A paper describes a structure:
Glycogen synthase kinase 3 beta (GSK-3β) is a serine-threonine kinase known for its ability to regulate glycogen synthesis and to play a critical role in many intracellular pathways, such as the signaling pathways involving insulin, growth factors, and neurothrophins (Wnt pathway and insulin pathway the most known). In contrast with most kinases, GSK-3β is constitutively active, being inhibited in response to a specific stimulus, and it can only act on a pre-phosphorylated substrate. The central role of GSK-3β in many intracellular pathways makes this enzyme an exciting and puzzling target for drug discovery. This widespread activity has also led to identifying GSK-3β dysregulation as responsible for the development of many diseases, such as Alzheimer’s disease (AD), bipolar disorder, diabetes, cardiovascular diseases, and cancer. In this work starting from a 19F NMR fragment screening, two fragments able to bind the ATP binding site of GSK-3β were identified and characterized through biophysical assays.
Unambiguous electron density corresponding to both G5 and G12 was observed in the ATP binding pocket of GSK-3β. G5 interactions with protein residues are reminiscent of GSK-3β specific maleimide analogs. The methyl sulphonyl group of G5 interacts with Lys85 and Asp200 sidechains via hydrogen bonding interactions. The core pyrimidine 2-amine is involved in a direct hydrogen bonding interaction with the backbone oxygen of Asp133 and nitrogen of Val135. The conserved water molecule next to Thr138 is observed close to the putative fluoro-phenyl site. The fluorine atom of the fluoro-phenyl portion of G5 is involved in a direct hydrogen bond with Arg141. In GSK-3β, water molecules next to Leu132 are involved in a hydrogen bonding network with the methyl sulphonyl group of G5 and Lys85, Asp200. When in CDKs Leu132 is replaced by a bulkier phenylalanine, this network is disrupted. Indeed, the presence of Leu132 and the related water-mediated hydrogen bonding network could be the explanation for G5 selectivity on GSK-3β activity. Indeed, from displacement assays, G12 is an ATP-competitive inhibitor not substrate competitive, while G5 is an ATP-competitive inhibitor of GSK-3β with a mixed inhibition for the substrate.
Author numbering: 36 to 385
Write the structure that this text describes.
């Protein structure tokens, strides 16, 4: 069995190409539609096809975003094509994406079942690359709005992390309100829990912080099946938000008091041997006030990631770390002066 379609490439000019794929497996499916795996007939490479029902009145926001994006820490849209087949007057948008075997979710859980934590070196590598991808998309004013371990793809050999699933992603314009029900359970910023509709891209930074803390703890940091339950687990760590903090998160005062608990020292949250810099980084990501959180780029420049800027740094398997320093002007526009930290001396050699 061999499907052949005429697809438009994700990047580059509109040059339609005959794409032929086989071994059409299935994997996940939910809020969008089905997701298949396949093998491309020529190159032999594996790819993931995300099929979704196409709306006639508007064009697909995921597609529109995916096409603008080109970055080595973000899944590549290789092609896209429209199809249907059988019952209904339904048009399906198919997104052909690079297949990436593992996810931070699966990896984290392997370590968690075996009562281990992921070696800090991998925490650094994975977290740094996430923050790069955030710095990039945020530079276009695009918020992902669903940062969680399941959406962080990993190549285990190269230690390369790629952000994926832009189904929730959106251009956040100041003054324009946005839906407050977007982020997944454990990774929602307090302002989202409080139902704020004037949130900024800092929600991604909170989410990322929840991933960091989770990789350090070996389990979700702010669990709970309700918002109430989540906010309690948060307050247990951060302490009770001041009236100031509360108005910063959500001006539309949903309106009620919380149990006055003081901040359980961040040091006592983690294992004894946990690097003090990792803890420091957490506390600067997981802040009540959206504007007080680090930017993605400021996070990349955090001391916690110093080891990665060492010229001698290698992966435990002996291979080189992936390219961490080739920042574009786009990536740096947030705050160009930071390049003095981000790009280390040995990366400037001619
Ligand atoms: C709908 S989705 O593409 O966002 N979702 C992520 C996941 C995925 N995406 C790509 N591009 N490549 C691989 C995978 C994936 C990885 C591990 C696994 F067990 C299942 C799917 C499927
Ligand atoms: Cl042509």
């Amino acid at each position: 069995k061999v499907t052949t379609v005429v697809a438009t490439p994700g990047q580059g000019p509109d040059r339609p190409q005959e794409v032929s794929y086989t071994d059409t497996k299935v994997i996940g499916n939910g809020s969008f539609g089905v997701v298949y795996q396949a093998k491309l007939c020529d190159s032999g490479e594996l790819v993931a096809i995300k099929k979704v029902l196409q709306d006639k009145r508007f064009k697909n926001r995921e597609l529109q975003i995916m096409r603008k994006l080109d970055h080595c820490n973000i899944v590549r849209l290789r092609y896209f094509f429209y199809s249907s087949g059988e019952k209904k007057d339904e048009v399906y948008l198919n997104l052909v994406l690079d297949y990436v075997p593992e996810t931070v979710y699966r990896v984290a859980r392997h370590y968690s079942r075996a009562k281990q934590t992921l070696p800090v070196i991998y925490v650094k590598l994975y977290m740094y690359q996430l923050f790069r991808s955030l710095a990039y998309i945020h530079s276009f004013g695009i918020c992902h709005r669903d940062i969680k371990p399941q959406n962080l793809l990993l190549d285990p050999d190269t230690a390369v992390l790629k952000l994926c699933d832009f189904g929730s992603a959106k251009q956040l314009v100041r003054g324009e309100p946005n839906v407050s029900y977007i982020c997944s359970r454990y990774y929602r910023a307090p302002e989202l829990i409080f139902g704020a509709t004037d949130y900024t891209s800092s929600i991604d930074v909170w989410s990322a912080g929840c991933v960091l803390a989770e990789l350090l703890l070996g389990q979700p940091i702010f669990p709970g099946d309700s918002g109430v339950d989540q906010l309690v687990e948060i307050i247990k760590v951060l302490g009770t938000p001041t009236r100031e903090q509360i108005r910063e998160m959500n001006p539309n005062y949903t309106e009620f008091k919380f149990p006055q608990i003081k901040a359980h020292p961040w040091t006592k949250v983690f294992r004894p041997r946990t690097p003090p810099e990792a803890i420091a980084l957490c506390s600067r990501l997981l802040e009540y006030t959206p504007t007080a959180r680090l930017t993605p780029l400021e996070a990349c420049a955090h001391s916690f990631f110093d080891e990665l800027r060492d010229p001698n740094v290698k992966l435990p398997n002996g291979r080189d770390t992936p390219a961490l320093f080739n920042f574009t002007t786009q990536e740096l526009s947030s705050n160009p002066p930071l390049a003095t930290i981000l790009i280390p001396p040995h990366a400037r050699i001619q």
